[PDB]
From a paper:
The nuclear cap binding complex (CBC) binds to the m7G cap of RNAs transcribed by RNA pol II. It is comprised of NCBP1 (also known as CBP80) and NCBP2 (also known as CBP20). As such, the CBC regulates gene expression at multiple levels, ranging from transcription and splicing to nuclear export and translation. The CBC promotes nuclear mRNA export through its interaction with a key mRNA export factor ALYREF.
Numbering used by the authors:
A (entry chain B): 5 to 149
B (entry chain A): 27 to 41, 45 to 527, 539 to 790
Write the structure that this text describes.
Amino acid sequence: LLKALRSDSYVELSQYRDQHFRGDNEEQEKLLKKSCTLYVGNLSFYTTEEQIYELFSKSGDIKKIIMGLDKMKKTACGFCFVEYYSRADAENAMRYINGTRLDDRIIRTDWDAGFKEGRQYGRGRSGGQVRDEYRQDYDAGRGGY
Amino acid sequence: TEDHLESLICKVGEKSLESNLEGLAGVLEADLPNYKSKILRLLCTVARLLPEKLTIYTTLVGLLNARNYNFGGEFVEAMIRQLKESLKANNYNEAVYLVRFLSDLVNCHVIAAPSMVAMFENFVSVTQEEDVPQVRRDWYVYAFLSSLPWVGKELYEKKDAEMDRIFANTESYLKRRQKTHVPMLQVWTADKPHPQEEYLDCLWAQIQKLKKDRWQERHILRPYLAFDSILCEALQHNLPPFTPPPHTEDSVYPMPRVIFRMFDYTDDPEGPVMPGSHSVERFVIEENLHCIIKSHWKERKTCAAQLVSYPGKNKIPLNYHIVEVIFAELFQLPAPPHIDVMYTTLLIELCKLQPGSLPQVLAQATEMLYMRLDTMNTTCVDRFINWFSHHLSNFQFRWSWEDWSDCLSQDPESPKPKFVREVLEKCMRLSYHQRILDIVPPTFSALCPANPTCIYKYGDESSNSLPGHSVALCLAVAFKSKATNDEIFSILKDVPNPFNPLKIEVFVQTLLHLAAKSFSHSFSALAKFHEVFKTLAESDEGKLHVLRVMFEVWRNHPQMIAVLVDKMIRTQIVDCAAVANWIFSSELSRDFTRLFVWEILHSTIRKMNKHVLKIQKELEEAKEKLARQHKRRSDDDDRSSDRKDGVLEEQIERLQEKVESAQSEQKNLFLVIFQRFIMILTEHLVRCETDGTSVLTPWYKNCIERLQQIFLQHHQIIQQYMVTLENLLFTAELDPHILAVFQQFCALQA
Ligand SMILES: C[n+]1cn([C@@H]2O[C@H](COP(=O)(O)OP(=O)(O)O)[C@@H](O)[C@H]2O)c2nc(N)[nH]c(=O)c21
């Protein structure tokens, strides 16, 4: 092998960590590397489970998709978890589908430690994603301010 | 600086290059005596790993050889051993990269010219071998011809007399090569815009032109020309009498290819005159760009930046070449070199990297593909369908649809209207039904996709005379009350018996209609009532009947049935054999030409192929456990492991018989599909002959190419079934039209 060719700055994990996880940092480090679930970001509120399934099916087959619902409104908060059968298949989605526009909206993907019960609800104070509260600009895809 | 050496070796190509080369020789000399072994490894690896700039590294070897003759001695010998072992590993993709690297060395005076000629004599002499697959003979001829552009002029003048016989032998071989495999491989059967010909035929013609004009090319870059004075005094090295490894049964050779042209120099009048189709300098351009894609396929941003900054970009129009290369990688119908989705996003980053010109040519390139749809292999159309819809998806679905107004005044099954219908349907997958209707001009309203809504046979206002309607309403309240599985059986007990087909229809129609909101609800419903389906659909025909009623529920939502059947297979509701039979059933006959049904078939096949591999993998690791324990038993004489070995010994035999059970299941699946594929085609052929109608019909053309496509996507697995297919299904008595597909497939690899 070669040092330069083997480089791929898309499969490596980001600096994000789930503080709700039970365990130290290294537990995620080993778990994230051997993981088949990835998290998407800033989807449109009007997006549907069918669209995300169609887009990510290009990389490969999907085992289960978990929509990101509101804590109280029980409504989509523009994010979801996608789980693949094989790690190698999930890497292709992270390498290529990430950063590609969907429903006229740029999406962002990141690895996840694995789905757990109650983890799909937004952790923001209002009920959605935490980034929603700090957001200030006007966007119809995220229901305004 | 142990990690420093490999870093600076890769830095020379990026971004004063000749001055950079001169300095690189000096630093390499300083640590050569103590790091010679490591340096040889680095140079040997980069020779095959980085063919994009092999001319750069050859000059590096020449300078090192000029300063140290002894260094070039073992390096060539080490290089041969790498080539010798690479062939033994059947890794021919980089073997040609190595032989190219040796060929360019004679320009740097590292290699004696007469020795290289004798090297190529053995390569060409492979064609004289008998009882050897024709594919193997092709590769050696390809390896010799492919290296000629780098070694054309210099080698020819030294030893023209010998290689003229070599050229005659190569020319003699190409005349008698089998050409039965081209019709499967060519993307366009039509010849008028640009003919598609086998790579050897195209390569040979380019070599003839290069031979015609005294071996002069303008595109290639030769850094060693600047260092002419230094390399003159360097002493050449004579190659050992290399011989190709003997042919073995386990040896695997690369499949034959075909290079297609979609651009002509008249397409870009204002830009630089790009090389013609049969121009050697065009071949090196595509070859380098393919290696660029191969080298950096994982990093899309890095790959996009690398190819756009291709050396010698001023001479040749890059935009037209890069677009052609991407489509060349995408339409290699045996298998694209990487995942299909990579090319769709790669052009996106390319489009934003060069917004000035690239969007224009890409838009022009799309239109050129559209006009040639009359004769395009269907398996390539699906790739075209997926890319174009996806490319439209991340561009606000903006397109001049009014330009393609000719599709309306055609047969609805003609490729052009069919292409429009499929693109909108795929664009529907990524948006709303209303959204597609808005963008498309109203004149195309006939081609717009239908509204994906569930169809309920037992509607509230439809009729009360349908059988089982009273029972059907009982199912509705039971589902809304979250009934258990056992009490569901009680309701089904009242269904009259005309196994019971009526029970299946009423149960499926109600359950699917209740869970028609989303995929998650539908998936939950099947999981919630998993036992009900298994009990009811015990018989194979019962399993088949589940699919046909399921199709009627979601006839207007192809994506819904796309995943619904997938979940059924993984839950053992219906085996892959039932799905294959359902595809060719008369219920789907009207929509047999639709694209979504074929996505079903391939997904079912992939699940079977993936499952059998996992079982094989489980057997291998368990088998290695016996090897691991026996090694430890020999090291540590423990008598308590006899029972431990007995546990795994009875375990592995269960796996082994399961593999045979699994392989037989997989073998049966392909047997059913091919067996079911013959009867439908034969029926079409005889009725057309009886009625005198032309065989070539849009339905037949689409159907026959699907038979090729399933052969291509799983040729590796089908390799194990040559005896079965020949003796049972594909026989001499079969119609030549159908048999010709098997005729080319067997000759494709053998
Ligand atoms: C930003 N982000 C949010 N989530 C998930 O989204 C939900 C709420 O996330 P959050 O609390 O809004 O994220 P924050 O603490 O970084 O502000 C949880 O289920 C998180 O696991 C995330 N999950 C993963 N894997 N990666 C991320 O970068 C990420």
